[PDB]
Write a protein that binds this ligand. Structure first.
Ligand SMILES: Nc1ncnc2c1ncn2[C@@H]1O[C@H](COP(=O)(O)OP(=O)(O)OP(=O)(O)O)[C@@H](O)[C@H]1O
Ligand SMILES: Nc1ncnc2c1ncn2[C@@H]1O[C@H](COP(=O)(O)OP(=O)(O)OP(=O)(O)O)[C@@H](O)[C@H]1O
Ligand SMILES: [Mg+2]
Ligand SMILES: [Mg+2]
Lengths: 101, 184, 185, 101
């Protein structure tokens, strides 16, 4: 993990795998984020470089935290950035791994 | 055995098929690039068991069409035999009219390529293969002879692959981490 | 690929597994003869995706037990790493307590035997195998990495195979066709 | 295929594959069998010899007709006998095929 906590714009987060959301857990996290945001840990974000040095940010966990931040219409979400490679991505995506540029 | 490997190009074939209109056509797997393909094998035409699973995939062909996917069935029987079966009533253990093409594999080479040949009997196991719109093999399913495949399961898999495929249509973030992006 | 062939004895393995009680045990597939076995691979411990699929098979282990069937998971990770993952909270992407054994395949030899090795990555695909109570392979399922397996589909398969197996317990009819058994008009 | 129609005891038929029965279709066959049995064709029965000459009779089709004869409390069912080998059986049963004696 990169050192500090980064505020990643929700709009740049790629979430390629489906998840089942419990609306009550989403609402519960919405409430907590408003009241005591420090109690909601950062999600983990994989930062991958494309072949031409493009930046890509993948989110594979923290579904309910992400849903809650989108509900609050936040610009960014606290995240730990994990510098990763295309090879790492392919573990998740297999033959859906894009030819990232 | 065979050459069907997940994440690699699905083995191509050219074969005579009986088409939904009842006509013969020689087709290749590669003709369906741009579409998902569900390619399935079954052992033999005209056995004493009703071809319930083939009828199910045919009956539900619209649910596959809605997912831009083509269903294709295959056995080692001739295309002439496939057509006789199509033209045999269901009450006589027949197929009835089909919404899907039925490939003929009389040389057993397609079954061999897909590693589903029961070599002693010279018939295919119940193999089913999900091939993406780029021609890449995504899913292998092979059942021993007595147990059928689920249309519901197959549609589950197609939609799940397509979900993650669609999320690969991305361009770079245009956002760069640095000292300025640490959360306050 | 590999040596997993339908209608043939499933490739045996001996491997160190983390048992449901958290102990290590060297187990063989052949230990489970007399029972159906659902043997499944997954790529890696401790990735950034929650092991939803594994938790589902363990959570519903009772439904397999009702069918006299044993579920066993495997990956290339060490058994030490399996236990760390068991002992990791789910809110940290852990597995939590398991009702199923988790096999360690650090030489990739089991995955290769079952033909599910993704060679370019050194990890297994999402292969799942149904092996009957005689050790015979009955079903092959292999998914590319992004898509999980269904417990409902697996239970359907196990029950359908067992239905047909059970109807093979037959004895000779004690009725013989002849000129006497032709239906009367 | 053996020439005439044979009346096979329901109790000797081995039906190793599951079928889904429509109760209304079963009942409709029951009534027809009562009124006009000649309009209900024979089911097809596979006659297989075991290794030591045991006789086995397999039924793979005619599920509704079979259920209707059961419902009617009939002893036998009209059938066409088809002499078949263990190899033929294995097409249906795979590794469920018994070592028939
Ligand atoms: N009100 C709350 N409801 C749920 N979790 C909370 C709440 N407040 C703080 N948290 C913390 O936020 C984290 C939420 O993690 P959790 O694994 O439950 O969901 P998620 O990762 O956001 O979504 P998912 O696990 O479905 O991908 C945990 O560390 C939890 O302690
Ligand atoms: N009342 C009736 N309902 C249905 N079929 C009837 C009836 N009377 C006669 N028949 C004839 O009996 C046969 C029944 O065949 P059908 O394939 O519909 O059922 P089955 O073979 O007994 O069971 P299944 O096909 O479900 O295994 C057909 O030849 C049909 O024409
Ligand atoms: Mg019928
Ligand atoms: Mg979580």
């Amino acid at each position: 993990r990169i050192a500090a906590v980064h505020c990643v714009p929700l709009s740049v987060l790629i979430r390629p795998l489906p998840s089942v959301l419990d609306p009550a857990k989403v609402q519960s996290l919405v409430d907590t984020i408003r009241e005591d945001p420090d109690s909601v840990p950062p999600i983990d974000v994989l930062w991958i470089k494309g072949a031409q040095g493009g930046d890509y940010f993948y989110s594979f966990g923290g579904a309910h935290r992400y849903a809650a931040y989108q509900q609050l219409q936040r610009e960014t979400i606290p995240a730990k950035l994990v510098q990763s490679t295309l090879s790492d991505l392919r573990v998740y995506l297999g033959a859906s791994t894009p030819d990232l540029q | 055995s065979g050459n069907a490997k997940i994440g690699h190009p699905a083995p191509n074939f050219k074969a005579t098929a009986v088409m939904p209109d009842g006509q013969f056509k020689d087709i290749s797997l590669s003709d369906y690039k741009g579409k998902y393909v569900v390619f399935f094998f079954y052992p033999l035409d005209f056995t004493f068991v009703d071809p319930t699973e083939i009828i199910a995939f045919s009956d539900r062909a619209e649910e596959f069409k809605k997912l831009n996917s083509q269903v294709i069935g295959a056995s080692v029987d001739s295309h002439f035999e496939h057509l006789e079966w199509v033209n045999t009533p269901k009450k006589q253990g027949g197929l009835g009219p089909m919404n899907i093409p039925l490939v003929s594999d009389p040389k057993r080479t397609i079954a061999q390529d897909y590693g589903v040949l029961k070599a002693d009997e010279g018939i295919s196991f119940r193999g089913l293969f999900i091939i993406d719109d780029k021609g890449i093999l995504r899913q292998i399913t092979v059942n021993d002879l007595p147990v059928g495949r689920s249309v519901d399961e197959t549609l589950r898999l197609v939609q799940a692959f397509q979900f993650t495929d669609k999320h690969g249509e991305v361009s770079p973030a245009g956002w760069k981490p640095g000292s300025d992006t640490i959360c306050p």
